[PDB]
Design an enzyme around this catalytic site. Structure first.
Site, PDB file in Angstrom:
ATOM      1  N   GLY A  70       0.799  -1.214   0.000  1.00  0.00           N
ATOM      2  CA  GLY A  70       0.000   0.000   0.000  1.00  0.00           C
ATOM      3  C   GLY A  70       0.829   1.260   0.000  1.00  0.00           C
ATOM      4  O   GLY A  70       1.992   1.261   0.406  1.00  0.00           O
ATOM      5  N   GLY A  74       3.829   7.027   4.029  1.00  0.00           N
ATOM      6  CA  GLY A  74       4.780   6.175   3.335  1.00  0.00           C
ATOM      7  C   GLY A  74       4.114   5.030   2.616  1.00  0.00           C
ATOM      8  O   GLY A  74       3.025   5.164   2.050  1.00  0.00           O
ATOM      9  N   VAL A  85       3.742   0.442   2.709  1.00  0.00           N
ATOM     10  CA  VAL A  85       3.875  -0.812   3.445  1.00  0.00           C
ATOM     11  C   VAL A  85       4.241  -1.897   2.445  1.00  0.00           C
ATOM     12  O   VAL A  85       3.631  -1.988   1.376  1.00  0.00           O
ATOM     13  CB  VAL A  85       2.585  -1.192   4.186  1.00  0.00           C
ATOM     14  CG1 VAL A  85       2.854  -2.357   5.132  1.00  0.00           C
ATOM     15  CG2 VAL A  85       2.005   0.012   4.904  1.00  0.00           C
ATOM     16  N   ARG A  95     -10.668   2.859   6.244  1.00  0.00           N
ATOM     17  CA  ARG A  95      -9.390   2.668   5.564  1.00  0.00           C
ATOM     18  C   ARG A  95      -8.298   2.233   6.539  1.00  0.00           C
ATOM     19  O   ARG A  95      -7.257   1.710   6.113  1.00  0.00           O
ATOM     20  CB  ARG A  95      -8.957   3.966   4.865  1.00  0.00           C
ATOM     21  CG  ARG A  95      -8.878   5.201   5.807  1.00  0.00           C
ATOM     22  CD  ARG A  95      -8.275   6.497   5.162  1.00  0.00           C
ATOM     23  NE  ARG A  95      -8.232   7.552   6.173  1.00  0.00           N
ATOM     24  CZ  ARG A  95      -9.270   8.323   6.487  1.00  0.00           C
ATOM     25  NH1 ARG A  95     -10.419   8.196   5.822  1.00  0.00           N
ATOM     26  NH2 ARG A  95      -9.161   9.233   7.443  1.00  0.00           N
ATOM     27  N   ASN A  96      -8.456   2.550   7.833  1.00  0.00           N
ATOM     28  CA  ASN A  96      -7.458   2.220   8.851  1.00  0.00           C
ATOM     29  C   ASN A  96      -7.799   0.978   9.643  1.00  0.00           C
ATOM     30  O   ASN A  96      -7.251   0.773  10.732  1.00  0.00           O
ATOM     31  CB  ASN A  96      -7.223   3.400   9.789  1.00  0.00           C
ATOM     32  CG  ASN A  96      -6.616   4.571   9.062  1.00  0.00           C
ATOM     33  OD1 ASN A  96      -5.742   4.381   8.229  1.00  0.00           O
ATOM     34  ND2 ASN A  96      -7.040   5.792   9.404  1.00  0.00           N
ATOM     35  N   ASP A 138      -2.405   2.174  11.565  1.00  0.00           N
ATOM     36  CA  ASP A 138      -2.113   3.586  11.294  1.00  0.00           C
ATOM     37  C   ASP A 138      -2.306   4.449  12.548  1.00  0.00           C
ATOM     38  O   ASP A 138      -3.293   5.173  12.703  1.00  0.00           O
ATOM     39  CB  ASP A 138      -2.970   4.103  10.132  1.00  0.00           C
ATOM     40  CG  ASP A 138      -2.405   3.717   8.773  1.00  0.00           C
ATOM     41  OD1 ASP A 138      -1.226   3.325   8.699  1.00  0.00           O
ATOM     42  OD2 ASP A 138      -3.149   3.788   7.772  1.00  0.00           O
TER      43      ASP A 138
HETATM   44  C1  LIG Z   1       3.221   0.586  11.868  1.00  0.00           C
HETATM   45  C2  LIG Z   1       2.035   0.171  11.082  1.00  0.00           C
HETATM   46  N1  LIG Z   1       0.836   0.684  11.368  1.00  0.00           N
HETATM   47  N2  LIG Z   1       0.028   0.098  10.480  1.00  0.00           N
HETATM   48  C3  LIG Z   1       0.645  -0.780   9.622  1.00  0.00           C
HETATM   49  C4  LIG Z   1      -0.094  -1.500   8.596  1.00  0.00           C
HETATM   50  O1  LIG Z   1      -0.953  -0.927   7.931  1.00  0.00           O
HETATM   51  N3  LIG Z   1       0.256  -2.838   8.451  1.00  0.00           N
HETATM   52  C5  LIG Z   1      -0.297  -3.765   7.536  1.00  0.00           C
HETATM   53  C6  LIG Z   1      -0.496  -5.120   7.779  1.00  0.00           C
HETATM   54  N4  LIG Z   1      -1.026  -6.018   6.912  1.00  0.00           N
HETATM   55  C7  LIG Z   1      -1.370  -5.478   5.731  1.00  0.00           C
HETATM   56  N5  LIG Z   1      -1.924  -6.164   4.686  1.00  0.00           N
HETATM   57  C8  LIG Z   1      -2.158  -5.319   3.618  1.00  0.00           C
HETATM   58  C9  LIG Z   1      -2.749  -5.761   2.344  1.00  0.00           C
HETATM   59  C10 LIG Z   1      -3.327  -7.033   2.205  1.00  0.00           C
HETATM   60  C11 LIG Z   1      -3.885  -7.438   0.990  1.00  0.00           C
HETATM   61  C12 LIG Z   1      -3.877  -6.579  -0.105  1.00  0.00           C
HETATM   62  C13 LIG Z   1      -3.309  -5.316   0.014  1.00  0.00           C
HETATM   63  C14 LIG Z   1      -2.750  -4.910   1.228  1.00  0.00           C
HETATM   64  C15 LIG Z   1      -1.730  -4.062   4.024  1.00  0.00           C
HETATM   65  C16 LIG Z   1      -1.234  -4.156   5.348  1.00  0.00           C
HETATM   66  C17 LIG Z   1      -0.679  -3.268   6.284  1.00  0.00           C
HETATM   67  C18 LIG Z   1       1.983  -0.753   9.997  1.00  0.00           C
HETATM   68  C19 LIG Z   1       3.133  -1.499   9.429  1.00  0.00           C
END
Ligand SMILES: Cc1[nH]nc(C(=O)Nc2cnc3[nH]c(-c4ccccc4)cc3c2)c1C
Length: 291
Positions: free
Chosen positions: A31, A36, A38, A158-159, A172
């Protein structure tokens, strides 16, 4: 005053989270957007058996964003492990760009999941019981944050990430704060206006009750299967006037009257009138029992 409650988020980073950068293998980008990007990754040595596992790594591009990542990491480190929060596995802060490692959630963000599943609504389908569960889980995660004197400040669909088992995890935490010493938090970057309480827009104050207002907007996204709040209304002077005047969104199509009742109370102009996350949890639990 010379005495203060000590804020753990302000304390220096604990190096127990430190993870070697060399033990990470980056895969594809999960994403972009707000903070930033991920990236899915493989991490070694996290298991007691020394096996490799899949993780998500948050990083920024090459200075408010730099501190927000560090803030998120410390808030997660203070919060501890919870079922309804994305869990912190490790961090890389030495010898390179700062990396925050968290558990990987397969389904991705709840907002995109509900849009993908909107047509299918009503075995892999979505129904009203899933929506009630999502309401309840997020309320539980929020009620946990409040118990630790923590305010997310960016609660939205979204979060919220959806993991295996139809379990929702909040993520987030870049805007999140701990308000133990002061009852009100006052901010002085870009902000999620459609999700903000009025006192937060007009007076810049954030409280447990401002987090409840955001929860109500989340319910509106949930029960409308991922629709944008205040549809077709740009953020402008007219929008601000209607919010101050007391104009609120109408009930989404799939939402039960009782769940809409909670949205309305989350949207009360008076923060004292709004329910707590503890009371929301109770309310939803009784509604689930009636089935
Ligand atoms: C510090 C921090 N705060 N928050 C996150 C966060 O957002 N971590 C985190 C976990 N697992 C995820 N899976 C997916 C995803 C799955 C399927 C398709 C597309 C995307 C995004 C994602 C993000 C982080 C790191």
């Amino acid at each position: 005053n010379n005495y203060s409650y000590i804020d753990p988020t302000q304390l220096p980073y604990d190096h127990k989270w430190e993870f070697p950068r060399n033990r990470l293998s980056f895969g594809k980008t999960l994403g972009a957007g707000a903070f930033g990007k991920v990236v899915e990754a493989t991490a070694q040595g996290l298991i007691k058996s020394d096996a490799a596992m899949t993780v998500a790594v948050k990083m920024l591009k090459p200075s408010t964003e730099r501190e927000a990542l560090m803030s998120e990491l410390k808030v997660l480190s203070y919060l501890g492990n919870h079922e309804n929060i994305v869990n912190l596995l490790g961090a890389c802060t030495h010898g390179g760009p700062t990396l925050v490692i968290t558990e990987y959630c397969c389904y991705g963000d709840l907002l995109n999941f509900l849009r993908r599943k909107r047509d299918s609504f009503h075995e892999n389908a979505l129904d009203l019981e899933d929506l009630l569960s999502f309401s309840y889980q997020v309320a539980k995660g929020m009620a946990f944050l409040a118990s630790k004197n923590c305010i997310h400040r960016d609660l939205a669909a979204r979060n919220i990430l959806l993991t295996h088992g139809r379990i929702t995890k909040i993520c987030d935490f870049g805007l999140a704060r701990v308000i133990k010493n002061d009852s009100n938090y006052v901010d002085k970057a870009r902000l999620p206006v459609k999700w903000m309480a009025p006192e937060s827009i007009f007076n810049s104050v954030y409280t447990f009750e401002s987090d409840v207002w955001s929860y109500g907007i989340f319910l509106w996204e949930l029960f409308s299967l991922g629709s944008s709040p205040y549809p077709g209304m740009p953020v402008d002077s007219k929008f601000y006037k209607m919010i101050k005047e007391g104009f609120r969104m109408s009930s989404p199509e799939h939402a039960p009257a009782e769940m809409y009742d909670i949205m309305k109370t989350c949207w009360d102009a008076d923060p004292d009138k709004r329910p707590t996350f503890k009371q929301i949890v109770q309310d939803i639990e009784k509604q689930i029992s009636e089935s």
